[PDB]
Structure formats: C-alpha cells, structure tokens
Symmetry: D3
C-alpha cells in the first residue's frame, strides 16, 4: 500500500515492487513523507483522483517510450492493459480508469472499450489477438496484418525522442486496431511533429531556410507567390485581428523575436492546438488561432494540391491517424487563406 | 500501512495486526473504501492531523477502560507510552504526539515530559520505574508506593462506566506520579462525576430529593436556609443576566424542563465547564456560566465548612487531583453567591 | 485580531473587547486552539467567507433579541449598522457585508442600500434620522412617526421568545422604514408565527382543539364544512401525490404521528417554507408542498372572507409586512383547494 | 447545467427539466445560492465525486420506490439504465458511474457489466430484452419468465415502506436477471427485513412476545430450551467479551433499555451488518458482532432444521437472493452458539 | 451557466455569448472538463471567490487595452460598469464585486462607489455623465471637460503595450473623474513606466547610456556629482545593509549581472514596489528596498529641482495621478540620499 | 497575532515586532490581505502546518547567513533555539516544532533533542554551554573546544554565498556538538559544494578544464586513464541504462548541452541527491542516478587513494560531517565504476 509506494519512489525512483515502508502524510492535494526531522513533499495532485491514488498511478508510470498521446486519442484508445501512461505536461494519467494497476481504479477487463495493449508486456500480444475491440502497439511488424506505421518520433518520460541509429528505446512503432475482431486498414497519413515554442528543431532545408530568410526571398525561392504565405504561415500583425498564423513553424519563428504572448485554454498533446494570441507591438490579437505542426514541406505539398479556381472548399487531409479539415479560400487564382476548422 | 489498517478496521473492527489490504481513497478530510460497486466513507477527520494519520490513530485506539481525561490533564500527562487514547466526544486523540504507535507521529521516548504508562502493557511498569518524570495507571495497588485512588467511575469506548460487582473492565484505578524519580504523595481529594444533561443519574438520597422536590421543601429538609441554594444551585432566571446555576445537577434539573439553550465554546472532559446559557421564557442569559458536577452532598459539605462572617474569600478545594478555587461572597451571615474561577 | 478574538470567545463567551491572546490554527473550514496538551475545535465554518472571518463575525454576533429574520428580509434590509446578526439554524450571518464590525467585510456606510439601525446602539437613532433609505428597530415607540408594530415574539440566541410580563429582553419591536428620507406608512398585517415541528405550542383554543380532536368533530364545531379542511389543513395521504397540507399546525399534527419524512431544500426564516414530503404508510409524496405557519384562527378568518362562487382567484393578503398571494380554487360553492404561490 | 439544476431543486424540489437559472457558488464540499441578501447552503457533498456533479446526481435522483440496495448488490447490479438511485443514509449514489443521466459520469451502455433496467422508464423492458447480462425490476409479472419475487417492503425517499392495500408506490417487485441472454431461475429464499434500532416494528406474534416477555417465559413458550437463545438472541453481557447477540430483534430489544453503544464501521444496506458493541453496565464489548435482521420465526425455523448432534458445521441458507453461511457449534445435543460469517 | 462558459472558453477562447455545453467537474481550486476520455484542467483559482465564479469572471475578461491598474487604484476606482478587468500577474479581477457581468457577484448599480465607465461599452458615456461619483476612460477627448491625459503605454491581455503609429488597440487614454457631479482638475503629473526586470527597454539616450557606461563616466557626463547617484541609483553593496537602489533602471542594470535575489511580499501593479533584496556576493541585504520606475531623465529632473542647502525635506511629487512623497537628505551641499517613504 | 504579522510583513518586509494590523483572509492554503479594493495573496502553504502558522514561521525567518541545511541534518539537529530557519527551495521550516518563536508550535525547551544554538542570539552561548545535547553555530572559535570548521560557503536568504574579503554576513562557521555534556571531536572531513545545474561556477583549474576540454584531452592531461572517468564522471549514454554520471560537475557539463531531463523525487539540501534521468537523444535512462557535488580535485584525490587491485570494496569517506559510503569496482588494475550506495 501507500507507505510501500512511497518507499519505492524514494529508494528506487518509481514503483518496482520492492519491499519497505516510509511514513506518509496525505494533506489535501499533497503527499508528504517524514525524512529525518523534516516533512518532505513527494507529490502534488493535478488530477481529479484521490491524492493517494494519483500518486500511486504516477509512481506506476510505465517508464518506456510510446506514441505521442495525440495518436492514441485519435485511435480512440479508452484505457491501457496492465500499464498506465503518465502525461507530464498535464501531470495526469491518460484516461481515468485502469486495468491491473491500482485496485481502487482497476476495472474488470471488459469490455466494449478500445483497450490498448503493448507488446513489451507479457503475452499482451496473445491477449490483444483475442480481444474484439482493441489497439496494439509494437516495436516490430506482426506477420501480415494491416498496419499503421508510426512517425519518426516518440514520447518518453516527458520528452519527444527522434528516431535514429543510436536510440535505445523504440521510436518507430507499428500500430494495429481491431474494431469487431476485424483489422482496420486506413489510408496512409501524414504526421504532425509534436514540437513546441520551447523545443523546436527544423527537419528539412526548407524549414532551415524558413527560420532564417527574409520572407520575400523565401517565397520567391520556393514559388509560393500564389499561396498566401505571408498571411497563412508568416502571419499578419498590422490589423486589429491578428491574421493567419496557422503553422507552428511560423508561430515559432515569430515568438522567437520576443513580442508574443499566448494562452492555451485546453492544454495537452493534440493534432490541432488553439491559442489566444497577442502581438505586443501592434496589439494585434486573435481569441482562437488554430495551429498545426506539419513539416513545412508537407504543409506546402497540401497547398499545391489545391484547386485555386474555387472560392471556398473544405479540404480533407489524413493526419495523425484521423481526418483533419481545413478551410481553403481563394480569389483571382490565389489563396486568400487556409486554416483548420 | 494504510490499506492494511483499512482492512483491520473493516474486518476486525479496529487495528489488531492481522494481514490484508483494502483499496482506500483519501479525499480531503475523509476516508473511503471500495466495497462492491460503492465507495463507502469510513472516517471523518476532526483532527489537526493529516487525514490518513488521524484515521490510523483512531484504528489503533486503545480499547480498554481508563481514568477520565480530565484526570490525566490535571496530573499533567503529556503523552502515552505505547498506546493512544481516543476521545469520542472530540473525535480526536489525547495530546498530539505519540510513542510506539504510529511512525509519523512517534517521538523518541527520551525527553523530560510526563509520560503516562499502563499496567496492561507488558513491561510498562518496569519502564515507568526507570523513568524520572511520569504517571502510572493500574488496576491494582503496587506494593505500597504513595497512591492516588481514583473515583468510582472511568471512561470506556466513549461511555462513563460505574464501579460494581458486574463490571468486566477495571473502574477503580490506582494512579502514581513520579517527579525527579520520586513519587508524589496524594492530597486527599473530592471527585467531579463526569455526568451530563443527556446521561445523568443521581448518586445519593440528597441528589434524588433534589431532582424531584419543590425548592422550598428541599432547602428546609437539609437546613440550607443560609446558603443561597435558590441563586447558586436552582438558578435565578428572573433577571436580564442569568443568576448563579454553578452546579451541574441544578443545570440538568433545570434544562430537562425544556426551556434552556446551551453552547459550550470549548469542549472536552474537564473539572470545570463553561456554558453560554439562555432561558427561553425569560430571555435571561449568561455568556460564561461556570459549572462543576460535584456529588451534591459534597458541594453541601463544602459550604457548611465555611465562615459566613467574611464578605469575600477565595476558597481552595482539593478536587480531581488539583486545587480548585471558588469565590464565596457573603452578607449578614448568609451566602450571596458561590462560584468557581 | 484573530488570537485575541479566540481569547474573548474562550474566556468571555463571545467578543467584548477584553485583552488577551490564545494560539490558533486555521485548518480548512475549522478553527482550533491549543489548550493544555490538546488541540480543541472552536468553530466550523458553514459560510462562503474565509474561515477566520466567519469565526470573527460569529464572535462579534449581537447578543440581544431582535425581530425574526424574515421580517428583516421582507422590509428589504440589506445590511446592519455597527452590529451583525447571527442566524443559528444556518450558522451564518444575515447578509454578507458588514458595517463597523470587521475590517475585512466592512463596506463604507455611504451607498443607497437599506441600512438597518438599532436603538440599543448609541447614536443609531440620529444616524437613522439622517439617512434617506433605511430601517429602524426599537424597543419603544419613537414620538409619533408611522410605525409597524411587530408580533408577540422575537429571535434571541437561536430561540423564539414570546411576549410576557417575565421577559427580560424586549420582544415587542417598533419598526420604522424610510425611503427617500420619507417614512413608509404601515399596512395593517397578519403575522406568521415562526414555529416548527420540534418547537410548536398552540396559541388559541381553536389551535388546541385542532391538535387533539377527531377531524369530523372539529370541522363541525367551527363550521368548516364548506372549506375543505380535510384537503387543505389535515392533508390527504390517500393518493400518489400528497394532497394539500399547506398550514404548519396541520403538518406538525400529522408528523408527530411518526410517519412523515421532510426535506427542506432551502433553509432559513421565511414567511413561506417549501418541503419535499413523503408519508411512510401510503408512499404519498409531494416535491413542493408550500407551508405557512399562521395562527389557525387567522387562517380560518381569511377563508371565511372569500367568495365560494368564483372557480379561481389569486387572493392577496398582507402578512409579515409584505403582500402574500394564494390561489383559491372553488366548485359548487365549496373550496376545492387553497395554497400559497 | 449547474444553475439550471439549482433552479429546479429550489423551485420544483428536484430535477424535472424546467427552464430557469439561479446564481450558484461551489465552495469545497458545498453548494450555495444567492437568495435575497443571503448565501444559502443547498448541498453537502459526502461523495468521492466533484461537488457540482454529486449535487446533480442528487437532483436527478429517481423519486420512486425500488428494491432495497442490498438486493441490487446481491444480484450484482453494477449500474442503472437512464436513472440513478440515491442512498439517503450514505448521502451517495448506488455505484459510481451512470448511464444517460449526467454527461460527466455517463459511460457508454455497451460493456459486459450487469445493467439494471426498470419498467417505469419507457422502452427499458425491450432494451433489457436485447441485452445479454442484466437485471430487470418491475411492478408486474412479465409474461411467465423465471422470476424472483421480492419481499413485502421496499425503499422510498430514504424510508422503508411496507406492502398494504393503501400503498401508492409499488412495494412488490418482480425481479429478473439475465446472464448470456439467458434468464436465471430463482432459488426460493428468505428475506432480511431492513429494520433498525430507531425504526423497528414487530412482524409476527412470536416477535411481539419476544419484545415484551421475560426470557425464561418465552424460551419455554416456543420450545427453545435446546437452542441457546440466551446466548444467541438475548445476548450475554456477563463476560469481558459480549457473547452472542446475532439477531437484530435481540439487539433492538436490548439497546432500547438504554445501556448500549454501537459503532458501525461500514455503513449501508446489507444482508449482514457488523457492529462494535459495548454494554455500559458491565463493560462487555465485542469489536465485531455480526447481525442479521431476520423475521424471528424464520430464524427459529432454521435452527429447528438442524442436527444438534454435530459439534461443528457451516450451514448454508438462501437469503436476500444469495447464499448466506453461518457457523453452528453444538455440544451434548444443544446449541452452544450460531452466527453468520 | 457553468457548462456554457466552459464551452465558450474551449470553442471561442473566452466568453462571447455563444451557445453549447461541456461537462465540467469543480474540484477544490480547479476546474476540469471531460475531453474525450481525459479530464483536462481549464482553471486554477488564485482568488478568494468560489472557483466556479472566478472562472466565470476570467472567461469574461474584457479583452481590450486599458490603463495600467496602478492608475485606477490611484483614482480610487472601486468597481467597473458592465465589464471586468483581469490582472494576469495576480490571476484575479480588479476588485471583488461586479456590475452586469456575473449574477453571483453583481451588485446593484448603486452607489457611493467610484464607478469606472469605458467609452467602448454601449452608452457608458451617457451613464457616466449622469453619475455623481465616477471615472471615465476614453480613447478620445470629450468636449471641454478637465482631463487627465494618460501616459505613452497601456495594459493589454497581460502585457504592457507602447504607444506608436502601428498600435491597433488604443494606448493613449483620456481619463475623467467626477466626485460630486463635479469634474476633478489635477495638476499635471509625471508617470512611472510599468517595466520589470524581465521586460525592460530604455526610453532615452540617458537610459541607454546608463545601462552601458561605467558609473564614473555616466555621472561625469551628466553633471551628477552632487546627486549621490552611486548610492541612490547604482546602489551600494559593500555594507551589511544594502544601500540606496530606489530607481528601477538601477535595479534592472544590477540584477542583469546575475547576483541578485528579490522577494516581493505584496505583488501587483503599483506606483511604488518594495523588495526584500539580497546581493549574493557581498551578502548585502535590505528588508524593504522601495523602488520606483521613473524615466531616468524624469528622476534626474526631480533631483535637480531640490534645494541642496537643507538637511532633511519631504519632497512631494505628482506621479501616476497621486502625490508621492520622497525623503531627501543633504549635507555639505550634496544629496546623501533620496528615497520613497 | 495574525493581523499584526501581516502588517509587519507588508510594512517592514518580515516580522520585526512592530505594531499595527491589516485585514486578512485565511483561505485553504492561501493568505490574502485587503489592500485598497483588492484581495492580495501574501502566502501559499507548502507545509503540513496550519496555513496561518506556516505564514507566521515564514514571516519569522531568521534573516542572517547560516550553514547549509545538509550540515545540520548530518549533525542531527532536531530544533532551533529562539529562531527558525526557512528553506526556500522547499518553502518550509527546518523541522516541525519550535522554541520561543510561535506559541502554537513552541515546545518547552526540553530536552533529549539536539538543540541548535546560535551565537548571534542573546546568551545562546551560555545556554548551549549548559545544555547536555546540543549544536552550536558561531562566527568565531570558542576557546579551546574541539571544533568542526565549516566550508568556504554558506546559506543566506535562499542563495549560496561564498567566503571572501567582501562578505558582510558570516560565511566561515565554527560548529560544536555536545552529546552528553561531552564535546564531539570528529576526523577532519571534506565538503560538498551545494551547487546546482542552474547555479554552477567552477572552483579550480581542473574544474575549468573539465567544463571546456574534450574528454580524451582532459583524461590524458591529469593521468586519469585508469580511473574510468568516461563512465563515472562524463557519463555514458549509448546504452539502455544510462551509465555512471555520479559527480555533479559531470551532470552540469552534460545538461548544459541541452539534451537532459531529470526529476528529483525527494527534494532539498543533501549530501547525496538522486535523480531520475533521461538523455533525450539516445533515450538512455536511469531511475536512481546518485550524484554528489564534490570539488573535482577532491573527487579525484579520493579515487587515487584506492587500491585498484581489489574487485569490490566499500569505500568510506568523511564528508559533510558524516561518513558517506561509495561502492568501488575494479578489474585488470582499473576502476570499472565508483558510485554512492
């Protein structure tokens, strides 16, 4: 129980099933332990769950790499099988109920929910394979079955981790989803990159050039005259309502100049983020600026696929294992704007 | 540990060291446990201690009779040795630290406080014998050391329990105190009786007559004409400020007539109790009406020991193992008033 | 200051400005004080105010009789001048702001609310006289200004107190109201009686007979054959929805037979009370049973004033210093039902 | 929405879908509403749920009779369909999730739990008919399916309600269970009676005699000489540990003599209740005294069915729709003791 | 209500009167919403107001530019008319009551308070013009009336915004204050600049030189030999008590060197801030270092107006629409020190 | 009391015994004060102590330099005499009880605890000299008595402060510890340096070279070939478990390259810290990486004292006034690894 989980956390960094106790006060949203003559705060509840339970779930993070939470949400994963994923930005669990982790939150392994199974847990593959409605995460292709191949990054202990020769946790995942004992077989999709304004590195020569070039030079170099990059990507700050700015790399490049404030009402990994943004020289502002983190070469691809001869169209692009809708507006053979709905 | 304590409480009624776990939530001031499909509340913290600890001390409460708290307080007992005492009216523990009971609240035995030891704990006698400043409680005379002999009642699981041939927990306690490794010699002493307005039973013929007789018939039967019983005991409710009423039997008799509201600002076993009393016919009230529950015969004895000559006098009485002081005001060879301070 | 207030409450029963300090903890909704070796709870916040403030207003409560809250509410008294009134059922104060009582909740006297002043506070009369929109309460007629004369009862320290030669706080209040520096002229008025199912005493011969007589014997003794007393007063518990029962004496009589459960959603002194009532033999229930506690004679008088000709009618009655409306439904020259709205 | 729910509760007694808003504060465990110049408390959360939600489920409580909770628990009812059941003793709901009642706590109907459906909800029958694992409650036999017929009482708005010609909610429930889309065949069964020490009414001639007769006169009237009624039913309070007392009528009879303190660690409707009991003359106590409230005639029937030959035996009895086990210890052709486990 | 405000915030960035609901838990100081399968924290109360209300007020920020809060405080603005201002540093409202914004906090528009009206709200100008005691904020001069012209900056969504050709919110405000239906006409004042140690840009050539020059060169360049700039502006760190340092630009220049820790006990926009400062090389420290953010050319002006022939004088300067007092000490024709009282 | 402490804090920066009050709300974990028309947050409880008390203790920080908390912990200081030390990282007191500081937490000056006395308090030297079990902190040597000389740094108002010609608080302390009226006389020890990854400056030429050189050059320059510096100090990130990295300067140099995340479960000054570390390129990770902040020349000294001819040894080094144990593993005349247990 509680004292034992506190011991594990202090001694072994997290829950490992070791034995031993520490004294523990549970005080509103906080967990304290008596170390020597001092009471020391081990935990601070940002959950809707009883402070002692949240702390348990935390201590019982799964400490391995996995797909970013947005992907799981888009696959409609409800709950995990015999493990629990900690979202560090939120300081909470993915979901609210659990299976074979914590008695208080455990629910019977049943069963209309989309259960998420991971190959690194003992015989979860066999279990997944017997389960009507489920998701499977695997570091390796499984036979022949239809498979959503993951992107070139993954989530590990709070950080985003990029695929490469030297990585010691798995980054490239193979995802499987069965709906009524039948495997799902979606159309290939593009991926967002889970970068932020604190942690942004470019991924192509286009992105490198974008972050360093004058806007007029960049546009001219890549034949983007007709694609409204100044409104849509670079963003427009001369007006009372702040214009465009729907691609992250543009938001990143902009904030790095020091004159931007943003709030995000609904925080956490997601295919689309919405910001409440103010430019602090012009006072240009927008209450909902919807932004997406596509690789810029990828974003450009999508635009150049558009029929510019049509005034208004709902564009529908497979991303992060769903369909994302953009509005596209055009006039006189040019993009006026392009944004997420 | 927490869930093990929950298991003992549910399965065994209190803590007895049996093995087992139940799932537990700690939610602010409360403790819940999963039982079938429900979350049931098992505890309501009224302590200044962390809910999970207050619950543990509760479960570890000592299930045995003991001298009433006010005696412990008056012998200046600071803490108990290897047990803990639950006060059911307050829903708290006697004191705040503990010894050999709960790791979080245990202080080291060594210090110069008055530690209270009990014969029912193996080896506490001998420990008490090798401790300079301490209190000892026992069901039996120990050799011939100087001994305070307690009253004909004791506290058990929230109730007052009276001495008799049928009682199966001890009620007569032999109480020892040491200071500088030297026993204190008892001052012979009167005892308050720990009754209340809900649980009150007369203890002598005088007390019985008191509860049933017209006031004029009683005063004259017992020769109290010069002792202001009307004011002091019966109470005077004819004035804007409630007169007298300093003896509990008089307060009980009174309020059982249904026309009294009381408010006790500071609750708990005590030789003196202070009430904020109002009478609902006359609107007579007193913010601080000090009240002692003496055997009425004993209260009468004290008054008849006193010089009705002196106008004013602090009278010193040995009661409940301390000295208790009253003011006595007189005029023309009679008592005007008599009250504690 | 906090610890000084604690000192007054403990030593003096309430706040009277005496000097002294006690140690105090503020723990969520509670106040504790060190006393000997224990932490004793002195207060339980049931307010929307910070615990330490709610405790202060409590201690500063005015210890005197006053008109019952529903009268203050019906004269639209927003705040009190240099005193504060404790409601013991709610364990809160009347209103939310204060004047000249506690620095944290004091608003400036100047504003256009109805300030309630009291004769027992030095200089409040004259202040009331130089204030345009206000209410004045006093124990005595003031010269000959237009005056509402209160009922034969009042509130004191949580109790209802009845007028008599023995009462030592005032009960008969003379109540003044000013609007635009102009006195309002009283409408003669009936008064509800502030009784309840725990504390209920008959007030007339009719009320006594009511509580003891078979229903058929009473209806006929007082000529109520055409007034549906069975439905309206006695109550009908033969149907799935509890019929009638709109007068408190009828509800009291009923529930004292032991087969009634009530739930009052919104508690506190009020001319009308709404109950969620269930009868435990018949399972008859009504989610909203509106109830007035009129002297039964007064309720009878009103009915006998009415035209049994009209099928439906909103009847307007001056009560408790406001206008109170009832529906009266009739059929074939008799009352079907009669209730407040 | 919150303020609309507040409006229904205040104006309509509970939630019925009427339109309107009231201002509401959510303060820790409490709900307040502005009414005139005051903040009135409308709710006290005793749940593990967010205060504003607990309040909603409360307001949406189903206002109708139903089988007592312990029956639902014993049929293993996990959740209700399109209604929610309030437990007034606990001030909580039956279970923790909900279906078609509150958006925050609604889970999808699809899953393999036992969903409890009710005839009084339009279309619940047919839904129950197309659901594999479920429980059905109704006021009327449904065709001829296998049917458990409930007892002569039921729960309504906090009370126990008895069958009779005058009852205006149903009391006799016909109860169905399906597992694998297959009805379960009822085992004939005895019922506990859901009485308590505050609300207890005898149900047979034997029960009446029991409550009034000297013990020796009763034992002999009903031929119980070989059945240890003294120990088992009357209770033995002569020893340090309270002997027997396993039947509620015996506990009631006893405690109404005023010399008993009980503490129930785990509260709520249940076929077996466990008490921590103390007798205040003899100080006899038992931390875990298991108690069943059977019709006394039924308890007698069971004992007279048993072999007084065997020294020890687990006896299995169908009660409250489950199997209930007792130990029966015998010696020299008589009962020593008999208790639940 | 609450669910609708949550919807607005998620969908539209803030409250805009749109329609729709989201499920919402209110859990102590936090607001969560159910998004997909996760509970997501939308709000964290740093207010004294009920968590649901604070969140309402927030969602109902006025999202436009306005004068910094210090100016409103100095004008003694009590409350705002039909809008509410969010202080982002504090995470609270300006004030505690509201008008025409939130039912729970709304108070009648009356009325001894200094009500603050803004021209961008419909007919607030007409309202202000009819109101006895009020403040008016306007982006344009209003006729002829005496007018406090604002500084060259303003507060917008958490940031300070400087006046210029390109600004899209109003920065230059014209402020009006009536006290008894009479317009106030103060002496021209100077302004503080609302800069901090995180966000500091200079505003003159003097300030540029100050941030980059050796101290001896700067003083010599501007003839400040006799004005104690080393003590007063640069600050002195060689002594046990930390010397001078009362001008922000000096505090800024100093901290930027990396060896300064500061606490501020009473946070928020203000004409004078007080810091608890420690220099981490010398351990020089001061418990109350009072600092003011005057434009340095402005600060210098003030000093050079002083009669240096006088030992001690209370200097009185109009700033931020009040009078600020400085102590000035001189000896031998030089400033020893200059600081705020 | 509380209002006075609030006044002191606002007016004078901290508690100084001055007189005056401010209004104050105590609201859960927060303290607010009414300043003008706003409620302003003065305090946020991270303690286990009642919010009003924690705030008192804080306001009553001792505002002077002192030895880092790790040293006091290693000397087993229990409590301080007439002062209280604030740990700013934790936002808590050293310890939980107090002496002559705050009535609520004050315990009698007695007495088996190791009481800590400081020379800067009046006659604490005389008191210490009369006390059986105690610690003494002094800015100067006291006669002849055995003395632990402090390191070349100290803790002051939240920062670490280095000894030097210019320091105005004492940095070099002389520490004394008596156990039974007998002075303790330990073997000279080495010291850790209380640096962090936020605040790190080197202290020798070796440390300067370490922070700037290629690893192969540094090792070659200092003849560290046989001491496994690459594993132990620089750390190894090519493996699934993150290798070595037990010296802070190595952790510092590493994190400064931008690819490291760390959690610390048990925060606060300590001789050994444990981190939960992830390298964000390789995903190399360790759940408990134990780190020590020795001066690198000092760490090297210790290694070069080791017999490399032995496979496994518990090395025992006097540090920070205790003994710290390291594991040392060797093979083929080389260190494989060296770490704290």
């Amino acid at each position: 129980g509680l004292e034992n989980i506190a011991f594990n956390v202090v001694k072994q960094g997290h829950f490992i099933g070791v034995e031993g106790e520490l004294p523990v006060a549970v005080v509103n949203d906080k967990i304290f332990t008596k170390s020597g003559v001092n009471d020391i705060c081990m935990f601070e509840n940002k959950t809707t769950l009883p402070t002692n339970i949240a702390f348990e779930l935390y201590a019982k993070r799964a400490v391995r790499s996995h797909p970013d939470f947005k992907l799981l949400h888009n696959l409609q994963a409800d709950i995990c099988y015999k493990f629990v994923l900690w979202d560090y930005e939120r300081s909470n669990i993915y979901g609210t109920a659990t299976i074979g982790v914590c008695k208080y939150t455990d629910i019977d392994v049943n069963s209309a929910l989309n259960i998420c199974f991971d190959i690194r847990d003992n015989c979860s593959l066999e279990k997944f394979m017997s389960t009507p409605n489920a998701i499977f995460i695997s570091d390796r292709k499984i036979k022949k079955y239809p498979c959503m191949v993951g992107p070139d990054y993954a989530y590990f202990n709070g950080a985003i981790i990029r695929d490469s020769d030297v990585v010691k946790q798995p980054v490239k995942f193979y995802l499987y989803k069965k709906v009524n004992n039948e495997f799902i077989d979606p159309t290939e999709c593009i991926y967002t990159q889970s970068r932020s304004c604190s942690d942004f590195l470019p991924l192509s020569d286009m992105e490198k050039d974008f972050l360093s070039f004058d806007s007029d030079v960049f546009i001219k170099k890549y034949g983007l005259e007709n694609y409204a990059f100044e409104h849509v990507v670079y963003g427009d700050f001369s007006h009372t309502t702040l214009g465009g700015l729907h691609l992250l790399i543009g938001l990143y490049k902009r904030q790095q100049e020091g004159h931007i404030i943003m709030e995000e009402m609904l925080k956490g990994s997601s295919t689309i983020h919405n910001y409440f943004i103010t430019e602090t020289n012009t006072a240009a502002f927008k209450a909902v600026c919807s932004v997406i983190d596509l690789k810029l070469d990828d974003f450009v691809m999508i635009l150049k696929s558009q029929d510019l001869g049509v005034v208004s169209k709902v564009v529908k692009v497979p991303i992060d294992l769903t369909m994302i809708e953009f509005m596209l507006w055009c006039k006189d053979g040019q993009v006026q704007t392009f944004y997420p709905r």
